[PDB]
Amino acid sequence: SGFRKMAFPSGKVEGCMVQVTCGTTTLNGLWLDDVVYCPRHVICTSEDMLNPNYEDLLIRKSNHNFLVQAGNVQLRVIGHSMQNCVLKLKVDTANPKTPKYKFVRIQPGQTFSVLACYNGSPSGVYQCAMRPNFTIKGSFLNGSCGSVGFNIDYDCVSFCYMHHMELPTGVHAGTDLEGNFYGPFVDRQTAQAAGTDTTITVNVLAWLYAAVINGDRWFLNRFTTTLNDFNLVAMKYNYEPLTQDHVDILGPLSAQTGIAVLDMCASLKELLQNGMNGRTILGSALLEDEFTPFDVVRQCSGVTFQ
Amino acid sequence: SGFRKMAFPSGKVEGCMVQVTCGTTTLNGLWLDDVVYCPRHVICTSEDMLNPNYEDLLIRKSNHNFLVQAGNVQLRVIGHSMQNCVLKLKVDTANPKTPKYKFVRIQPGQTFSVLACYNGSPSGVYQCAMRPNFTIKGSFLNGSCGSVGFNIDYDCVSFCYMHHMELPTGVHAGTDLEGNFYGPFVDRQTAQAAGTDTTITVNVLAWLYAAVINGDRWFLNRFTTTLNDFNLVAMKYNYEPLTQDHVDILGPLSAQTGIAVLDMCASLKELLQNGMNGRTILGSALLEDEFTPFDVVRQCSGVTFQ
Ligand SMILES: *[C@](O)(C(N)=O)[C@H](CC1CCC1)NC(=O)[C@@H]1[C@@H]2[C@H](CN1C(=O)[C@@H](NC(=O)NC(C)(C)C)C(C)(C)C)C2(C)C
Ligand SMILES: *[C@](O)(C(N)=O)[C@H](CC1CCC1)NC(=O)[C@@H]1[C@@H]2[C@H](CN1C(=O)[C@@H](NC(=O)NC(C)(C)C)C(C)(C)C)C2(C)C
Numbered sequence: 001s002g003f004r005k006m007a008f009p010s011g012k013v014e015g016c017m018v019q020v021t022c023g024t025t026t027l028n029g030l031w032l033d034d035v036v037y038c039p040r041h042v043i044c045t046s047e048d049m050l051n052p053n054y055e056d057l058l059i060r061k062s063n064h065n066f067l068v069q070a071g072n073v074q075l076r077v078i079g080h081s082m083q084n085c086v087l088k089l090k091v092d093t094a095n096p097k098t099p100k101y102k103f104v105r106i107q108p109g110q111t112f113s114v115l116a117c118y119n120g121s122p123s124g125v126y127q128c129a130m131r132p133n134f135t136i137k138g139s140f141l142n143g144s145c146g147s148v149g150f151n152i153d154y155d156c157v158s159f160c161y162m163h164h165m166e167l168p169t170g171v172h173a174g175t176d177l178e179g180n181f182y183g184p185f186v187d188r189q190t191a192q193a194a195g196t197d198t199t200i201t202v203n204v205l206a207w208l209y210a211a212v213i214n215g216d217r218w219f220l221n222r223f224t225t226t227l228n229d230f231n232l233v234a235m236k237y238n239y240e241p242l243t244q245d246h247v248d249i250l251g252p253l254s255a256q257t258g259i260a261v262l263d264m265c266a267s268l269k270e271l272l273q274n275g276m277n278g279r280t281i282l283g284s285a286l287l288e289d290e291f292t293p294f295d296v297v298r299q300c301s302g303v304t305f306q
Numbered sequence: 307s308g309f310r311k312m313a314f315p316s317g318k319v320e321g322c323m324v325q326v327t328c329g330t331t332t333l334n335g336l337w338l339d340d341v342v343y344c345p346r347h348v349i350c351t352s353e354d355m356l357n358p359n360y361e362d363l364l365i366r367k368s369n370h371n372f373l374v375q376a377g378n379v380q381l382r383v384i385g386h387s388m389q390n391c392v393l394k395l396k397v398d399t400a401n402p403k404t405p406k407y408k409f410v411r412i413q414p415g416q417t418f419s420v421l422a423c424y425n426g427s428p429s430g431v432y433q434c435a436m437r438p439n440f441t442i443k444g445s446f447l448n449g450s451c452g453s454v455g456f457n458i459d460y461d462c463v464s465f466c467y468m469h470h471m472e473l474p475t476g477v478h479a480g481t482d483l484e485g486n487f488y489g490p491f492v493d494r495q496t497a498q499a500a501g502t503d504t505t506i507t508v509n510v511l512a513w514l515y516a517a518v519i520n521g522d523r524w525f526l527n528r529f530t531t532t533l534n535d536f537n538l539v540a541m542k543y544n545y546e547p548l549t550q551d552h553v554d555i556l557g558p559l560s561a562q563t564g565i566a567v568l569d570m571c572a573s574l575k576e577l578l579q580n581g582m583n584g585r586t587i588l589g590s591a592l593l594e595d596e597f598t599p600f601d602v603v604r605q606c607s608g609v610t611f612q
Contacts, residue, residue, distance in 0.1 A: 001476040004445035006430035009421065011317035115315065121610040124312035125431060137589070139310035141608045170307040170520055214476055283443070285591035302447045304427040 003210050003282050005290070006299055007113040007125045008152045015097035018075070019120030020089070020146065021067035028117045028146030029068065029089070030159070030177070032098050036068055036075070036089040037177060038146045039164050040082055041187050049189040058082055069120060070095075084179025085187050086162065099157045103177040106160045108132045109200045109240070111292050112149040114161070116140060129203070129290040130161075132240060133195040134183025135171040138163070148177075155306040167194055199289050201239045202246040205264055206293040209253035211281045213300050218279060220259070225266040237272045249293050256300075309516050309588050311596070312605055313419040313431045314458045321403035324381070325426030326395070326452065327373035334423045334452030335374065335395070336465070336483070338404050342374055342381070342395040343483060344452045345470050346388055347493050355495040364388055375426060376401075390485025391493050392468065405463045409483040412466045414438045415506045415546070417598050418455040420467070422446060435509070435596040436467075438546060439501040440489025441477040444469070454483075461612040473500055505595050507545045508552040511570055512599040515559035517587045519606050524585060526565070531572040543578045555599050562606075 020029040020038045024045060029038040041049070043057050061080070066089055068075040079090035106112065111129045115122055116139060128136045128149070140147065140163055149161030164174040164187055171194065173185040185192055212220065231241045247261045254261050268287075276285065297303075326335040326344045330351060335344040347355070349363050367386070372395055374381040385396035412418065417435045421428055422445060434442045434455070446453065446469055455467030470480040470493055477500065479491040491498055518526065537547045553567045560567050574593075582591065603609075 001447070001472055002443060002445040002478065004432040004434070004443075005311055006422070006432045006445060007313055009317075009320050009428035009431055010315045011320040011428070014315050014317040116312070118608045118610045121612065122315035122317070123608060123610045124605070125315055126310040126312045128310070137308060137310075139308040139312060139605060141307070141606075143608060166307055172308065280592065283592075286586065286589075299430070299445060300447075302424045302429060302449060304424045304429045306427065 001214055003214055003299065005127050006295075007127045008150065009305065010113065010115045010122065010125045012099040012152070012157050013115050013148065013150055014122045016095060016099070017115070017117050017120050017122060018068055018070045021069070022061065022065055026119060027143065028120055030146070030148055030162070031068075031070060031075075031091070031095045032101060034091050034094045036077075036091055037162070038087050038089070039162065039175075039187070040085055040087045040179070041164070042087065042145075051190070052188055054082065071120075082179075085164065085175050085181060086177070086179035100155050101157045101159060104158045104160050105176040105178070105180070106130055108134065109203060109292070111290055111295055112151050112160050114138055114149045114163075115147060116144055117147045118143040127290065129200065130182065131171075132198045132200065134185075135167065135173055135194055135197070136161070137170070138172040140166060140172055152305045167192065196238070199237070199239045199287070201234055201242050201289075202249065202293065203289040203291055204239075204268060204287050205242075205246075205250060205261065206253060206296045207282065207288045207291045208264055208268060209250070209257055209259070209293075210291065210296045210300060212257050212259060213253075214282065216281055219267050219271055219276070219281065221267050221270055223266040223270070224260075224263050225269055227262065227265070230262075230265040230269055233269050233272065239272075252297055253293060307520055309520055309605065311433050312601075313433045314456065315611065316419065316421045316428065316431045318405040318458070318463050319421050319454065319456055320428045322401060322405070323421070323423050323426050323428060324374055324376045327375070328367065328371055332425060333449065334426055336452070336454055336468070337374075337376060337381075337397070337401045338407060340397050340400045342383075342397055343468070344393050344395070345468065345481075345493070346391055346393045346485070347470070348393065348451075357496070358494055360388065377426075391470065391481050391487060392483070392485035406461050407463045407465060410464045410466050411482040411484070411486070412436055414440065415509060415598070417596055417601055418457050418466050420444055420455045420469075421453060422450055423453045424449040433596065435506065436488065437477075438504045438506065440491075441473065441479055441500055441503070442467070443476070444478040446472060446478055458611045473498065502544070505543070505545045505593070507540055507548050507595075508555065508599065509595040509597055510545075510574060510593050511548075511552075511556060511567065512559060512602045513588065513594045513597045514570055514574060515556070515563055515565070515599075516597065516602045516606060518563050518565060519559075520588065522587055525573050525577055525582070525587065527573050527576055529572040529576070530566075530569050531575055533568065533571070536568075536571040536575055539575050539578065545578075558603055559599060
């Protein structure tokens with residue numbers, strides 16, 4: 001029993017972090033096989049940031065301008081290239097700690113673990129969600145660039161995020177491991193709009209199910225509702241619309257608790273219209289939306305990983 | 307920028323988890339050098355739990371009754387002993403992945419990372435605090451026993467907790483790595499009282515400092531207070547008294563923000579007396595007490611570990 005914001009074990013990713021230096025800038029790289037991946041603005045100076053021409057900036061860098069370093073051992077770059085917003089440094093030594101891995105571009109509302117690193121060295125791990133506006137609410141300081149988000153599927157690490165930049169309200173933007181940004185962001189220091197952040201309704205429902213599984217039942221009411229009627233209310237409190245897929249995804253949690261999804265929607269409806277009047281649910285005084293239905297099943301049934 | 311409930315990287319602890327089986331029971335062990343550590347009630351059957359006599363139960367176990375297993379490799383027990391509530395299984399193979407480590411008994415209010423495991427395999431990592439009543443609010447299912455809490459100091463893992471048991475309200479009790487319980491709990495299935503849980507005031511203050519460092523300043527008021535006057539109010543909302551030590555510990559956070567501790571106490575005072583009126587602080591609608599001043603410094607300045 002119990003419910004906690006839980007990250008994946010980070011052992012398999014720790015051995016893949018190196019330190020990348022180009023002239024003055026130092027940040028983190030991801031070393032898999034004989035390739036190191038890092039944000040391409042490592043080739044920028046502070047002034048270049050306002051309006052970088054990456055092609056032109058890259059023209060005047062040779063392999064020997066890139067200092068790659070795994071612990072005290074020192075790797076040498078035999079080739080570099082730009083793939084979108086990431087730089088791929090080809091090195092002379094395949095990582096002997098390369099795990100089984102994939103690169104995946106995740107969808108908004110999915111969650112993942114971030115291993116925050118500085119100078120190629122792990123500092124900490126936490127779980128976060130891709131917000132519907134394609135930002136994340138992370139914890140990143142200067143030097144954290146190149147830190148990666150990941151999931152695990154048994155033995156296979158799925159890399160999905162690389163950290164690049166911060167936006168005014170302490171929210172964070174980055175790319176997938178192919179260098180494509182999530183959202184409309186670009187890697188330069190010029191004013192940029194993030195859209196409105198909405199609440200991931202299906203995640204809220206899964207967390208309400210986790211509450212119930214852990215005996216926190218007071219919000220369970222006696223009403224029901226329809227999917228169209230719920231969405232009419234959710235959309236006014238800035239919530240994602242619920243679809244029949246979402247209902248199907250919640251099936252396992254609905255079947256374990258004996259509470260139908262539409263019944264749960266009616267309880268959520270009331271929580272949005274009346275607030276929570278001072279109680280908490282699973283120790284929280286807000287509705288939590290950074291647990292997917294999979295995260296809840298995994299945590300409330302004990303899925304392990306190699 | 308940003309503030310997250312952050313766990314230590316778990317790589318160095320993952321390689322120390324094994325699976326321990328005795329007759330019917332299977333749980334987790336901690337394998338360091340040639341010793342495996344596990345909860346001693348692994349030698350119990352479901353019936354023995356109501357009133358185990360561990361000495362007598364242990365009398366009828368020999369080395370070959372204990373199946374220890376690291377992945378697919380299979381270790382053999384050449385000796386067993388009971389140290390308080392833990393069992394120390396002497397094995398024939400020193401763990402080649404033993405990190406530099408210590409055993410520490412932590413004090414209430416300190417935080418640590420838990421690597422929740424099942425069948426000797428890491429499932430996830432999260433951060434928690436030793437509550438003032440010597441429980442933790444974790445996330446543990448059947449099979450999680452033997453999972454360990456730890457901190458890191460650069461290269462040295464400090465093991466501080468081993469999970470044993472759950473109490474009615476989904477709170478958890480366990481031992482240090484020498485087998486002594488935290489709190490007055492004993493390892494048998496008989497009614498047992500946990501005391502009242504109080505709020506760790508110095509942790510709340512450090513989190514308020516983290517708020518301010520991250521620009522969340524609305525609760526900063528124009529009043530001040532005295533340590534005796536604050537404690538008179540804190541003690542009525544079930545808060546730990548603040549001492550001059552606590553003030554000294556907060557010095558680094560006070561110096562970074564320019565807000566004196568007593569001034570911060572006056573803001574906290576008002577938050578306890580008026581509630582937070584609907585806003586949030588660092589995304590939370592409750593006062594958070596599971597960040598030590600050290601956790602805040604570490605996260606808001608970027609301490610890394612080997
Ligand atoms: C990494 O590059 C690093 N070296 O660690 C760094 C990390 C961030 C998180 C704390 C600083 N990222 C940048 O410096 C990033 C690079 C320039 C400027 N960057 C920013 O994140 C800036 N944000 C910003 O300009 N935001 C908008 C575009 C105005 C919304 C900072 C002001 C935070 C430095 C580039 C290429 C975007
Ligand atoms: C571990 O032993 C395991 N094998 O994983 C197990 C983990 C807990 C967390 C989910 C079950 N612990 C126990 O089974 C533990 C062992 C018996 C009974 N235990 C309990 O935790 C019981 N709690 C309990 O009796 N609580 C009090 C004492 C009434 C407050 C359960 C009812 C949860 C099984 C012993 C030796 C205490």
